[PDB]
């Protein structure tokens, strides 16, 4: 039985054009996920010290 890495090469990494598409699609999803995660970390560290955390009191 082929391993997961073997499947990845045969289906996506064997041909460079498919290799490029995997990177392009991966970059799209990675950017959203990484930014969302990184923002969560930064906002958690600075909880209650950002405008987005204190605007509710002064907004409206």
């Amino acid at each position: 039985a082929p391993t997961l890495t073997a499947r990845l090469y045969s289906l996506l990494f064997r041909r460079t054009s498919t290799f490029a598409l995997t990177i392009a699609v991966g970059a799209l999803f990675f950017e959203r996920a990484f930014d969302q995660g990184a923002d969560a970390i930064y906002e958690h560290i600075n909880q209650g010290k950002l405008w987005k955390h204190i605007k509710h009191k002064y907004e409206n």
Partner: protein, 51 residues
């Protein structure tokens, strides 16, 4: 350019059409990703969360 109007070049095209199509998709996905088109990214299930 009648030099290329032959059966072999017709076969040559068919062999490289899937590859050219794949590279075109890479360009399309790259352009949408780089420019954040959002005409197309609205359809994308997880990316549409942004904006």
């Amino acid at each position: 350019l009648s030099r290329f109007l032959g059966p072999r070049y017709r076969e040559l095209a068919r062999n490289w059409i899937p590859t050219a199509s794949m590279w075109g998709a890479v360009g399309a996905v790259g352009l949408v990703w780089a420019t954040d088109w959002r005409l197309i990214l609205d359809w994308v299930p997880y990316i549409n969360g942004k904006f």
